Symmetry: C2
Subunit: 127 residues, 2 copies
């Protein structure tokens, strides 16, 4: 399977937020969905990952309606093109803080995520 | 390679809770630590995994002050012995809901966890 590309495991049924959007919404959706982190877009462009731990940092409750998803909240980690080879990149994917890595095309347009869970499921059948 | 055991990747710096403990504290600790789920013990004995999403189910924000961590909240998923072979069990580990699997000895004493992150990092070195 040496030539298998990130596209193979792409998922779009994963929480994704928009820059300037509701942080209360974001925190709730992350916590409810079993995800510690999710991509944040500006229009179509992937900008960064936001972590539930960061949204709840310092406070005792949940974000209020007024709180906005700023760029300062994001970890602007690398993305992968859907057409990149998965097996050229396992070291970096294993090292990523978030258990999914974001996919973006050549213009930076978000194309979903790939999870460590699905990568391991694929490898387990062939290792 | 072939004969590597779960023990090799075992981690004990991972959140762990105790039966009857504060659910609001547990939920707060999960969210602050970047973990969606963690083991719950009765003494040293592993009982099951608890999920942040389960703890928040039907709560507005945090669990109430009086709520205690009871066994009906747990996913009583399988554990692995530290001496079991990793390469005999990748399919089930990849399939687990939680991104970690609990280790327990022959008597069910909790011995840490093994994460999908560490397993993938280990594989990346040899694929």
């Amino acid at each position: 399977n040496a030539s298998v590309t990130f596209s193979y495991l792409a998922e779009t049924d994963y929480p994704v937020f928009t820059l300037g959007g509701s942080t209360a919404d974001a925190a709730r959706r992350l916590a409810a969905s079993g995800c510690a982190c999710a991509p944040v877009l500006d229009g179509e462009r992937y900008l960064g990952m936001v972590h539930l731990s960061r949204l709840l940092e310092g406070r005792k409750g949940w974000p209020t309606v007024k709180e906005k998803l700023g760029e300062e909240l994001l970890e602007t980690v690398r993305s992968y093109r859907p057409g990149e080879q998965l097996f050229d990149n396992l070291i970096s994917v294993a090292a990523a803080k978030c258990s999914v890595v974001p996919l973006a095309d050549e213009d930076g347009r978000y194309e979903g995520v790939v999870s460590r869970k699905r990568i391991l499921g694929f490898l387990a059948e062939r290792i």
